[PDB]
Amino acid sequence: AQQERDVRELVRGVAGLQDEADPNFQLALNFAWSNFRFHRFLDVNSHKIEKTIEGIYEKFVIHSDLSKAASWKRLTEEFLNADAHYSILSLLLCLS
Amino acid sequence: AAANLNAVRETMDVLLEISRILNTGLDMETLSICVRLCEQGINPEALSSVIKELRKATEAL
Question: Which residues of B16-36 are buried (b: 16+ CB within 10 A; e: fewer)?
């Protein structure tokens, strides 16, 4: 129920279509849902996400961006304490 | 209690900063949408796919 509202807001927000009575709104929505229901990915692997996070930290350190490395480690450590943790992180990694 | 909304406020702000370091382009409003969808079990790679195409075809409109 709130899912359906969320997907509509996602379309409005990301695609910039604020008028649900625009045929382009409904076309974007049908596409979003059809995309969501076409199961085609493996489930999120937490260990692989953790390796990537730690890889981002190394890259910051390698380039001597100390205030970004310390921030990166601090934020991800804090977040990873209270499955959805890794799903959220995977999405952000995919949008990087 | 009233102490759960400040907790959620703290995590959402951690997440937005993580999102900014990664340069995802998300605002706090759409980031909150994404969190709820992930918690409800939408596949994150499906959601990434949807978001990237809804962007690819809006500057084009």
Answer: bbbbebbebebeeebbbbbbb
**B54·A92 Cβ contact <8 A:** no
Q: How far apart are CA A79 and CA A61, in angstroms?
A: 20
Residue B16 lies in a domain: yes
Tokens of A29: 């929505």
- SS3 category, A16: coil
Q: Where are the domains of chain A?
A: 2-37, 46-95
- Report d(CA A92, CA A25) in Å as an integer: 25
Reported resolution, Å: 2.2
Query: Between the CA of residue A23 and those of A20, A29, A30, A87, B27, what are the distances in Å?
Result: 8, 10, 11, 31, 26
Pick the residue of A14, A49, A63 with the most B CBs within 10 A to test the interface with B by mutation.
A14
Technique of determination: X-ray
What is the distance between the alpha carbons of residues B23 and B8, in angstroms, rounded to a whole number? 22
Q: Which residue of A has its CA nearest to B10?
A: A79
